[PDB]
Amino acid sequence: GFDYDVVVVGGGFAGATAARECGLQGYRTLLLEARSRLGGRTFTSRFAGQEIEFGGAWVHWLQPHVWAEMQRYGLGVVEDPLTNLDKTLIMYNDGSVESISPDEFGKNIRIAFEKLCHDAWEVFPRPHEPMFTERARELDKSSVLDRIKTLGLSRLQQAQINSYMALYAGETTDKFGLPGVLKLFACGGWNYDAFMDTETHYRIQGGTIGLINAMLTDSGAEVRMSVPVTAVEQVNGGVKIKTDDDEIITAGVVVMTVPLNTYKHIGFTPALSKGKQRFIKEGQLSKGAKLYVHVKQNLGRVFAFADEQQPLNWVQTHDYSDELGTILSITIARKETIDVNDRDAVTREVQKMFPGVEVLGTAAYDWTADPFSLGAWAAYGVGQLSRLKDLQAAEGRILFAGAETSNGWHANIDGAVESGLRAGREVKQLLS
Numbered sequence: 001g002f003d004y005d006v007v008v009v010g011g012g013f014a015g016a017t018a019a020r021e022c023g024l025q026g027y028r029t030l031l032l033e034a035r036s037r038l039g040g041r042t043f044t045s046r047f048a049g050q051e052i053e054f055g056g057a058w059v060h061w062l063q064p065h066v067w068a069e070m071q072r073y074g075l076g077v078v079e080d081p082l083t084n085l086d087k088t089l090i091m092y093n094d095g096s097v098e099s100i101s102p103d104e105f106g107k108n109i110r111i112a113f114e115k116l117c118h119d120a121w122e123v124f125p126r127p128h129e130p131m132f133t134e135r136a137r138e139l140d141k142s143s144v145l146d147r148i149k150t151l152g153l154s155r156l157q158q159a160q161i162n163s164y165m166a167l168y169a170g171e172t173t174d175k176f177g178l179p180g181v182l183k184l185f186a187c188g189g190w191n192y193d194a195f196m197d198t199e200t201h202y203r204i205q206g207g208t209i210g211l212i213n214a215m216l217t218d219s220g221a222e223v224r225m226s227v228p229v230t231a232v233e234q235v236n237g238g239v240k241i242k243t244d245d246d247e248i249i250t251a252g253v254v255v256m257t258v259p260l261n262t263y264k265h266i267g268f269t270p271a272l273s274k275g276k277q278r279f280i281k282e283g284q285l286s287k288g289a290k291l292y293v294h295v296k297q298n299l300g301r302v303f304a305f306a307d308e309q310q311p312l313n314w315v316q317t318h319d320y321s322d323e324l325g326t327i328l329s330i331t332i333a334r335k336e337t338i339d340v341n342d343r344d345a346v347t348r349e350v351q352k353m354f355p356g357v358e359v360l361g362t363a364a365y366d367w368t369a370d371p372f373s374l375g376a377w378a379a380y381g382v383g384q385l386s387r388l389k390d391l392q393a394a395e396g397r398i399l400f401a402g403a404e405t406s407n408g409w410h411a412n413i414d415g416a417v418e419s420g421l422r423a424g425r426e427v428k429q430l431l432s
Ligand SMILES: Cc1cc2nc3c(=O)[nH]c(=O)nc-3n(C[C@H](O)[C@H](O)[C@H](O)COP(=O)(O)OP(=O)(O)OC[C@H]3O[C@@H](n4cnc5c(N)ncnc54)[C@H](O)[C@@H]3O)c2cc1C
Pocket: 009, 010, 011, 012, 013, 014, 015, 032, 033, 034, 035, 038, 039, 040, 041, 042, 054, 055, 056, 057, 058, 059, 199, 200, 227, 228, 229, 230, 257, 258, 259, 262, 266, 288, 289, 290, 367, 371, 372, 373, 375, 376, 377, 378, 401, 402, 403, 404, 410, 411, 412, 413, 414, 415, 416
């Protein structure tokens, strides 16, 4: 009697995976996507005549779920070559910019990182069960900043590790939950070189959008875009989904894959469990944005860190040449520190870092300003990871997926895929 067997809300990797799992079981499947595009927090675009990535793009074979999908659909890796750096910079909170030899730069960040994750081997024997250990549950009382003050790092190492960690937090390190960082490093084999190789090294052949289209075509599910969901009501043996144009779609089961910071704008009747509402209100930490800057001068191959109080926390050469100039890939930890769609502020901060250059153009994506992300990658605040099962738990015939709800690579494409497989199995148990 329902319009569809299962409705999936959201066309990111969590939604595409769930829709594919449901479709291949023969269920009549519908996916509703708020934007006029798919991919969610993965978005490939173009700038200054080149391909650029505004969100997620990089993967690794140490991430099980996304790698198995690439095997399923015959997609290989595309390498961004490690390359030698000409300059590595650190910008401290005082505003001073230092140029360090790239060989000193790598040694100091590794020392600081390895001391911060010294206990990951003991505390997370099973990174896919983060709360297995007691130590893990007692560490969720502390922030990443709490550990860094005890490590006794030099001024350079602390600025490096704090900038790198502010980037993973999308926020200041005093807000950043400690165990979530150790668990992610545990997922990469408890090893520094293995984990660092997963970061900005390999992209998917055909792009993230190609693998998302592969799964959705394979699912057979009906896909609608520019259809935001505004409310969900639990009916008798199903659910009622209301779109922003007030039309009602009925289904036996509905799967939520929207980012956690967007649940505030969807109404649920009846109300969800209070443990769920708590993560509904708090949200996830990251307030990041992504920015690309085109400069007339050819800076070669540069990398820079800036600490939490400064705007351009992660800068790296995307491409360079004398004819082109330099295209810089920049990640902003916090929205409050700079408006990426304000060019004049962007030009000043690039010039502060690289005095003497004039920006020819800028391309930005402010994920925190976007109504359908309201934040960047998944980052847990202090105490959140221990209550993660409140966010994963099904509420009647409403299932919940998404990178934030995953147990492994929660800050990654892989975590979204993992949650999609779990959601598909929970669909299989309700429809039987
Ligand atoms: C700048 C940035 C860089 C990143 N780089 C990497 C990387 O290099 N490697 C890696 O592994 N991961 C990376 N990530 C993380 C990765 O992008 C995410 O973890 C993953 O895409 C999350 O998948 P998801 O489906 O759970 O969320 P989403 O991709 O956000 O999917 C949710 C979908 O639901 C839609 N939606 C929202 N609200 C509604 C609504 N009311 N109704 C209908 N639809 C709605 C949204 O528009 C969206 O399409 C990055 C993230 C960011 C922000």
